[PDB]
Amino acid sequence: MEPFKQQKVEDFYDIGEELGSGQFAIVKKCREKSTGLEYAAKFIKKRQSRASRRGVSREEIEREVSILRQVLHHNVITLHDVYENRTDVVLILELVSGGELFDFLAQKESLSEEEATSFIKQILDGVNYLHTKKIAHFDLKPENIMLLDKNIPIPHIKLIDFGLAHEIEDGVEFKNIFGTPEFVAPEIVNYEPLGLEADMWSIGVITYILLSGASPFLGDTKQETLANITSVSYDFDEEFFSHTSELAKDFIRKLLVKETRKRLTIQEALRHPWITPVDNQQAMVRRESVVNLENFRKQYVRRR
Amino acid sequence: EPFKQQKVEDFYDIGEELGSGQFAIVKKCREKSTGLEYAAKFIKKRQSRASRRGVSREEIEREVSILRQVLHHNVITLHDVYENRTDVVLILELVSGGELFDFLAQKESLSEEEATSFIKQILDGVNYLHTKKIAHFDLKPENIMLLDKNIPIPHIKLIDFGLAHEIEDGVEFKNIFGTPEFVAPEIVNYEPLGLEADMWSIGVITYILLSGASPFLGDTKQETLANITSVSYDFDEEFFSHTSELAKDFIRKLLVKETRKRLTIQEALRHPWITPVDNQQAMVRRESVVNLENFRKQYVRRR
Ligand SMILES: [Cl-]
Ligand SMILES: [Cl-]
Ligand code: NA
Ligand code: NA
Ligand code: NA
Ligand code: NA
C-alpha cells in the first residue's frame, strides 16, 4: 500500500506550465530530475476537517489513488508516483500533452463516420478495461478525452481525471449527485442507484456531440438541462443530423435510455454494427457518411 | 429598469476585494459624486449555453429583478446596476461588520435569549421575502452578515441573492443547487421547490448556532446527501447538554421532510422559543446557555 512520499516535490521535480485545474486541484507539467522524464503533477488540496469549504477529503483522495494504481491500459492515464505535504496530495501522472480530442477534430478538413468510430472505439476500449475491473469513471465528457500527440495521423486517446471514479460493489447501492449536468445520466439527477451504466449514457452524449456539434439535453440554464435529461427529451433534428447514418443514430438511441437495465453495456456497444460492421455493404455506408465539421467547429469555438 | 452602460470606474473609485464567489467578485467602492461607500459585485457574463464559465442572462436578470423589489432592514439593499462587454456589476449596500458566526465566536457568554435575538432578525428578513413569494434558496451562515460589530446587539443583513427565485402558484420549480450541508431533501430528491426549503435551512443554521455541530454533515458529500434524505440527525449530549427543550422542539419542527408539515415562516415566528407565551418559558430561555467553546472550536476549523 505504497506510502505517499513525504519529500518535497520540488526537490525531485522541475515544475513547468499549468495544464489545467478543477475546483480543488491544479495540474502542472513536471520533469523527474533523476531520470529527465516528463510527467503531469496534479496538486489536490486537502481539507481541514469535514465542514471545510475548501479541499478534498482524505477518503476521496485515497479512492482516486487506489483506482489509478490498478489501471494499466493504452487508452487510460497511468500513475507514476504520489507525494503529500502539509497542504496537498500530489499525483505524478503520465503526461498527456496533445490537447482535447475535440480541439483536434475541429481543425480537420473533413471527418467520416469511419474515422469518427475509430476515435469512439478507443474510448470504448478504455471504458471496457475499466468496466471489466468494476470501475466506473463517472466523469466521461469531452475535456477528459485527451490525446497523446496531435501530430500523428490518427491520434491516440487517453481517458483522464479519475476524481469521480468509483469501484462498483456487489449488492451495494451507491447514490450521489456529481458531475457536469450536460453529461450526466438520469440516475444521477434522480439520486438513484448508480453503476457502470452511467458511463454508457455519457458515451451516447459525447457521440451525439461529436457527430453533430449539438448537445442532446443542454438547455438555456441548468434547470432546463435537468428537466431534459430526466424526461429523456432529445432529437435528431435534420439541422444537425442531415449527414448522419441510421446506424449512428441507432447506436446513440440505444445508449440514451433511462432504464439502466435496457442501456447497452460496454461489450454490447463494442459489438454494435456502427462500431463493428457485419459486412462490406455496411462498412461502405459508414465510410461515405460524413460529419459536418462547420457545425462542429461553430459550437466548439462557442465553448471557449 | 435598464442597466447603466457607462464605465463603472468613471463613477466609482474601486478598491479591495471583499469576496470572490461563483462567477462573481465583490470589491469595495465609493461613488465619486456623493462620497458614499458600497460593494461592487462583478458578475461574469456567460458567452454560450455550454460556455465552461460565466452566468446566463436569465440568472443575472433574476437576481437583479429580485434585488430591485426588496427593501427591508434585514435585507441587503441594491443601489445601482452597470453592464459592460464582460460583466454585469451590482452596486450593493456595503455590509462591513463580518459574518454573524464570527461575532458570536468572540463572545464570552451567549444565552438562548440572546441567540433568539439574532435568529428573530433572520426570521424577520425571511418573513419579508416570503410575503413577496421570494425564496432566498442560499440561507447559510456565510450569507448572514452584520452591519457593525461594535453595538451591543449587532444588526443582521441577509445577502447573496444569486439563487433566489420567485415562487409562482401552480408553476412547478425543480432544480438542484446550493451547499449540500444546508439544502433541504426536496432539493436532493429533485422534487417541487418553494418557500419551505428556506425553513429547513433556518433549522440547520439554528442547530449550528446552538451547538457548533452540523445536523447532516457527513465525512463526504455522499454521506451528507444520505443523511439529508433520511432525515438522520441527533441532539448528542456532547453538543446539546445545555440546550433547552424549547430550542430542540423548534429545530425538530423545521427539520421535517414533508414540505407541508414543516413550519412556515409565520409559524416559526410564533413558536414559543422565539415568542414565549409565559414567564416560565422566558426564564428557561434566559437561563439556557450555548457552550461557546464547542462553537468556537468548530467555527475555527472553518478557517
Ligand atoms: Cl479528511
Ligand atoms: Cl471506489
Ligand atoms: Na452527423
Ligand atoms: Na448560469
Ligand atoms: Na430524486
Ligand atoms: Na445549546
Author numbering:
A (entry chain A): 1 to 304
B (entry chain B): 2 to 304
Show sentences the authors wrote.
Members of the DAPK family are generally involved in both apoptotic and autophagy pathways and share significant overall sequence similarity with myosin light chain-related kinases and triple functional domain protein-related kinases (Temmerman et al., 2013). DAPK1 and DAPK2 bind Ca2+/CaM through a closely related ARD, which is inhibited by phosphorylation of an identical ARD residue Ser308 in both kinases (Shani et al., 2001, Shohat et al., 2001). They also contain a basic loop (BL) in the kinase N lobe next to the kinase active site, which has been identified as a DAPK-family-specific signature motif (Tereshko et al., 2001). We found an identical type of dimer arrangement in all three kinases that involves the BL of the CD. In terms of functional implications, CD dimerization in hDAPK1, hDAPK2, and hDAPK3 is likely to inhibit catalytic activity by directly occluding the kinase active site.
To explore the molecular mechanisms involved in human DAPK regulation, we expressed and purified truncated versions of hDAPK1, hDAPK2, and hDAPK3. The hDAPK2 crystal contained two of these dimers per asymmetric unit, referred to as chains A/B and C/D, which provided an additional assessment of experimental error (details described in the legend). We addressed this question using hDAPK2, as its high-resolution structure provides the most accurate data on dimer interface interactions. The second main dimer interface is formed from positively charged residues on the DAPK signature BL segment, which belongs to the most mobile areas in the DAPK structures. In DAPK2, the main residues that contribute to the polar interactions are Arg47, Arg50, and Arg53 as well as the active-site residue Glu100 and Asp220 from the loop preceding helix αG. By contrast, in the DAPK2 structure, Glu182 is blocked by an interaction with Arg303 from the ARD, which acts as a pseudosubstrate. DAPK2 comprises an additional C-terminal tail segment that is predicted to be unstructured, and which has been shown to contribute to kinase activation via another dimerization mechanism that has not yet been fully characterized (Shani et al., 2001). This could result from pseudosubstrate-type interactions of the N-terminal part of the ARD with the CD active-site area, as observed in various CD + ARD structures of members of the DAPK family, which may occlude the ARD segment from being accessible for Ca2+/CaM binding.
